[PDB]
Design a protein around this nucleic acid. Structure first.
Ligand code: MG
Ligand code: MG
Ligand code: MG
Ligand code: MG
Ligand code: MG
Ligand code: MG
Ligand code: MG
Ligand code: MG
Ligand code: MG
Ligand code: MG
Ligand code: MG
Ligand code: MG
Ligand code: MG
Ligand code: MG
Ligand code: MG
Ligand code: MG
Lengths: 177, 188, 260
RNA sequence: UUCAUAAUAACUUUUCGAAUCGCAUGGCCUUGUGCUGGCGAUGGUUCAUUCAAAUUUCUGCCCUAUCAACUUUCGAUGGUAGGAUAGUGGCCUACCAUGGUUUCAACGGGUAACGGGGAAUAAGGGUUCGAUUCCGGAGAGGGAGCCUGAGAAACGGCUACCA
RNA sequence: GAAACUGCGAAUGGCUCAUUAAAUCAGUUAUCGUUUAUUUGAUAGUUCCUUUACUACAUGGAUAUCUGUGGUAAUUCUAGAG
C-alpha cells in the first residue's frame, strides 16, 4: 500500500507504492510511535529505520495515537484531540477512527525516517527543502542566530526579495517583542 | 441533570403537577463531594457566572481555630468520630461540614508552650516578664488538657469542603465539648 | 427568553419618546448606561426626532462618530446612549447646550440652556455607603460613584456635580419647604414645594407637593428630586415651569396667545 | 440585621495587581538615545449603576359530583444537620414528628384551553370570542443528557434511544 | 488586503400554540435570599520575603494560515512532515 515517508532534517518527503505482501509484513502488529528496521521493508532500504507515526485506513479513516486496537472504533472527539477539528466552541462530535495497531486494513502508512542508511533515496536522503520563512520574535531570531543578544538584532532579520517583472521589492517580517 | 426545582414535587394540597417546561440549566444540581482523608486532591468546577468552585475530596490537612485565646493553626485531620446527620459518613470516614474530627494537636501544644509554658500532659528576660505579666491566667479547662495528654484534639469542622475546598473548623471547647462527649459516651 | 433581550419593538417603546406608531417595526433600544431605559432617552431619538438635525440612522451615526455630541463633558459616540434626566448635551457646532428636563406634559423637551451653567450638573443621591478600606462614597441617580463626599450628605438628598472634575461642589438637604421636581408617574414635569413627607413605617415614603399656582398633589419619594429653594431654583426651569395648567386653561392659553 | 466597613489569628494544590496596541512624538537640557512627557484603544481586581436572570407575597381562572375524600412505604406536611444550589427552599440525603388540602368543591376527569392587553355585540346588566401585529410562557419530530459562556438543558450546537 | 489564529455575537430576531387549569399570566410586593459579559462611575504602590549579586532597554515553547505528501465514493472528513 501507499507509504508516505518524510525526512525531517532535510525537510523532504515522498510517496512509495509497495505491492509485495512480505515487505509490509513487519509493519503488522506495530503501533504508532514504534521503530522498525529498514532491512526488512526493502532491499534498497538498507541502514534506514522507520518511526511509525499515523496512517490512513482503506476506508479513509486515520489512525489515532494511543488507541492500541487493530480495528476501528467510534469516539467522542473534542478540541485538543487529533482526528477532528471543532467548528463551534466546545463542539464535541462522535466520529469513527482507526485504531493505533497497524493491520492489513491500512491503506497509507505515514513513516518518519530516523537513521540515515547506506543506499540514498532519490530526492529525500539527497535533496533538502528550504524553510519557507525564518524566525519572527526578536529573541527567537537571536537564538536562531546565536547573536550575543546585545548586538542590535534589528538589522539581522531576513529579507525576501521578489521581482514584480518591473520593480524589485523587499519584504521582511515585523519583529515582535 | 439532578434538578432542584419545585415542579416535580406535589402541590401543598397533594395534587400531581403535570409536566411543564422541561428542566433548565439554572436549576441544576451537581454530585455530592463526599470528601475523604489523605492525598489532597481538589477539583475545580466552573459554576454559573464563572466563580470557580472547589471540590475538596481526599483532604488531609486544614486550618483550625481556638476560640478561647483565639489562635488558628494549620493541622492534620485524623479521622472523623461523629457526624450529626448520618453515622454512615462516620463509618466511611466521609468529611462534610459540622462533622467532628480528631486533631494531631501538636501545633497548639508547642504554641501553648512558647506562649505560656505550663508543660501539659503531666530564657530571655523579655519572655519571662511577659509570662509574669500573664500571671498564670491560662486556666483553660480540664477536658482539653485531658485530650492534650491523650494527644488528639476534638474539633468540629465549620467550612464546607464541598463548595469552598478548604477544611477549616474550630476545636470543641466549653460546654460544646461537654455536649458532644456525652454523645460520644453514648457511642461508647 | 434565554438571556438578555436586545430588540425594542416600536409599540413597546415608552410613550414619552412618543415616536410615530407607523414608519417602522422597531424602536431604538437604549444600550446599558447611566439611566433606566424606560426613563432614559437615546441620542438617536434626541437628534433625529427632537432636534431634526439628522434625517435617519446613518445621519445620526455620522453626527455621533465625528464627536460633536458631548454628554456631560464626554463624547459618547454610540447611537443608543441613554442620555437621561438632567444630563447635558453639548454641540460645539452651533455652540449649543441642552439640559434634559421634563416638560409638564411629561416629556423630554428640548431645553436650550446657557454655556455658563452648562459647566455643571445636578444629581439625586440614591445611596450613601462605605466602600473598602473604610472610604465613604455616594451613588447618585446617574450611577456616578463620587468618592469622599461631605459627611452629612444623606440619602434622597441632592448635589451639584461640577461635571468637569466630577467632584462635590455643593448640595441641598431634603426637608420641608424646598423647591422640588417630579420624575415619574402622572405628575411628570411638575415643580413645587415639599409641604409634608409622611414616613410610612415599612416602605414607600410619600411627599406632598404644592406648586406656585397653589395646587397640591402627592408623590412617592423615589419619584422626587429636590431642585433648589423656593424662588431660587438651582437650574434654569423649562418654559412654563411645570404648573400643569388645566386642559380648559390650556385651551384658554391657545385662544389668548394667538397671532396669525 | 451577624448590614456596610474595620481589626486579630491563621489558611490557600496562591486570583488580581498592564512583558498589550494607535496617533502625536512636546518639554529639560544632566546634548544622550539621556531624563521625562499628551490624547486615546484594548484589557484588569473590587464596589456600584444599567440591560437583566432566577426565584417570591396577596387576589383573581372555563365545564364537571354519572369525580367526596385526596397525599405519605418511592417526600406527602413539619423539625434538625448535612449535600447541592449563584442563592432561600424536602431541592436531595440521614434521623425524627404524623402531618398538609377538602362541601368556601379539595383530588380526579374534560377543555376542538396557551394567559393577558383586547374583539364582536350594546339602554342599563351582560353573552360569546381572544391561534395572530404588543407583553409574558412554552416548543423546535417525541423524549432524555451535556460542552462552550455572563447568559442554552440551545436544537439554522452536539450525544444517545424511539418514529 | 484574501486566508487563518485571536476577540465578540451566534441564547437577539422570526415562527407556532402542542403540552400546561393556582399551572402560565395580570395587577401588586420582596430579594436583609442570589448570579449578572456588556454600558457608565470610581477603584490597587507591598508581585522584594532577609532586599550585600536579577531579563525588566522586554522571558519560553508550541500552534494555526502557508509550503508539500496523501487517504475516502462521498461530509464545513483532515493524518504525516517543515
Ligand atoms: Mg425571542
Ligand atoms: Mg459581613
Ligand atoms: Mg438547610
Ligand atoms: Mg391545545
Ligand atoms: Mg392570544
Ligand atoms: Mg384563551
Ligand atoms: Mg389550537
Ligand atoms: Mg409573542
Ligand atoms: Mg427552547
Ligand atoms: Mg414538523
Ligand atoms: Mg460570550
Ligand atoms: Mg432541545
Ligand atoms: Mg430550522
Ligand atoms: Mg433559534
Ligand atoms: Mg453543531
Ligand atoms: Mg385539570
Amino acid at each position: 500500500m501507499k507509504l508516505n515517508i518524510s525526512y525531517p532534517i532535510n525537510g523532504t518527503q515522498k510517496c512509495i507504492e509497495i505491492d509485495d505482501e512480505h515487505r509490509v509484513r513487519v509493519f503488522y502488529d506495530k503501533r504508532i510511535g514504534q521503530e522498525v528496521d529498514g532491512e526488512s521493508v526493502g532491499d534498497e532500504f538498507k541502514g534506514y529505520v522507520f518511526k511509525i507515526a499515523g496512517g490512513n485506513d482503506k476506508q479513509g479513516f486515520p489512525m489515532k495515537q494511543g488507541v492500541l486496537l487493530p480495528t476501528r472504533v467510534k469516539l467522542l472527539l473534542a478540541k485538543g484531540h487529533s482526528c477532528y477539528r471543532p467548528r463551534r466552541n466546545g463542539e464535541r462530535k462522535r466520529k469513527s477512527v482507526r485504531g493505533a495497531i497497524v493491520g492489513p486494513d491500512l491503506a497509507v502508512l505515514a513513516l518518519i525516517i530516523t537513521k540515515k542508511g547506506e543506499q540514498e533515496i532519490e530526492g529525500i536522503t539527497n535533496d533538502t527543502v528550504p524553510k519557507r520563512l525564518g524566525p519572527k520574535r526578536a529573541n527567537n531570531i537571536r537564538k536562531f542566530f546565536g547573536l550575543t543578544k546585545e548586538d542590535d538584532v534589528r538589522d539581522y532579520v531576513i529579507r525576501r526579495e521578489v521581482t514584480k517583472g518591473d520593480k524589485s521589492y523587499t519584504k521582511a517580517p515585523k519583529i515582535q517583542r | 441533570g439532578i434538578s432542584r426545582d419545585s415542579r416535580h414535587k406535589r402541590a401543598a394540597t397533594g395534587a400531581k403537577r403535570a409536566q411543564f417546561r422541561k428542566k433548565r440549566k439554572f436549576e441544576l444540581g451537581r454530585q455530592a463531594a463526599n470528601t475523604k482523608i489523605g492525598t489532597k486532591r481538589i477539583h475545580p468546577v466552573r459554576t454559573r457566572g464563572g466563580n470557580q468552585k472547589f471540590r475538596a475530596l481526599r483532604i488531609e490537612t486544614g486550618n483550625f481555630s481556638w476560640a478561647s485565646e483565639g489562635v488558628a493553626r494549620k493541622t492534620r485531620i485524623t479521622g472523623v468520630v461523629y457526624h450529626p446527620s448520618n453515622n454512615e459518613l462516620v463509618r466511611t470516614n466521609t468529611l462534610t461540614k459540622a462533622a467532628i474530627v480528631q486533631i494531631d494537636a501538636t501545633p497548639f501544644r508547642q504554641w501553648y508552650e512558647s506562649h505560656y509554658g505550663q508543660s501539659l500532659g503531666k530564657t530571655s528576660k523579655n519572655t519571662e516578664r511577659k509570662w509574669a505579666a500573664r500571671a498564670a491566667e491560662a486556666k483553660i479547662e480540664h477536658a482539653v488538657d485531658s485530650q492534650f495528654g491523650a494527644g488528639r484534639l476534638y474539633a468540629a469542622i465549620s467550612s464546607r469542603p464541598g463548595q469552598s475546598g478548604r477544611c477549616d473548623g474550630y476545636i470543641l471547647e466549653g460546654e460544646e465539648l461537654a455536649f458532644y462527649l456525652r454523645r460520644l459516651t453514648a457511642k461508647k | 427568553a434565554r438571556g438578555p433581550k436586545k430588540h425594542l419593538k416600536r409599540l413597546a417603546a415608552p410613550h414619552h419618546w412618543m415616536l410615530d406608531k407607523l414608519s417602522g417595526c422597531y424602536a431604538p433600544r437604549p444600550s446599558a448606561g447611566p439611566h433606566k431605559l424606560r426613563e432614559s432617552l437615546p441620542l438617536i431619538v434626541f437628534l433625529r426626532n427632537r432636534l431634526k438635525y439628522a434625517l435617519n440612522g446613518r445621519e445620526v451615526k455620522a453626527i455621533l462618530m465625528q464627536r460633536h455630541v458631548k454628554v456631560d463633558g464626554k463624547v459618547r459616540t454610540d447611537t443608543t446612549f441613554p442620555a437621561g434626566f438632567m444630563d447635558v448635551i453639548t454641540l460645539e457646532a452651533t455652540n449649543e447646550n441642552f439640559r434634559l428636563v421634563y416638560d409638564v406634559k411629561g416629556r423630554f423637551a428640548v431645553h436650550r440652556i446657557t454655556d455658563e451653567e452648562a459647566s455643571y450638573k445636578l444629581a439625586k443621591v440614591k445611596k450613601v455607603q462605605l466602600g473598602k478600606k473604610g472610604i465613604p462614597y455616594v451613588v447618585t441617580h446617574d450611577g456616578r460613584t463620587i468618592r469622599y463626599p461631605d459627611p452629612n450628605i444623606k440619602v434622597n438628598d441632592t448635589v451639584k456635580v461640577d461635571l468637569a472634575t466630577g467632584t462635590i461642589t455643593d448640595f441641598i438637604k431634603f426637608d420641608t419647604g424646598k423647591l422640588v421636581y417630579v420624575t415619574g408617574g402622572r405628575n411628570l414635569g411638575r415643580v413645587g414645594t415639599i409641604v409634608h413627607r409622611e414616613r410610612h413605617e415599612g416602605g414607600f415614603d410619600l411627599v406632598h407637593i404644592k406648586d406656585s399656582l397653589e395646587n397640591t398633589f402627592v408623590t412617592r419619594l423615589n419619584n422626587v428630586f429636590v431642585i433648589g429653594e423656593p424662588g431660587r431654583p438651582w437650574i434654569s426651569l423649562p418654559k412654563g415651569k411645570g404648573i400643569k395648567l388645566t386642559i380648559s386653561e390650556e385651551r384658554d392659553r391657545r385662544r389668548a396667545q394667538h397671532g396669525l
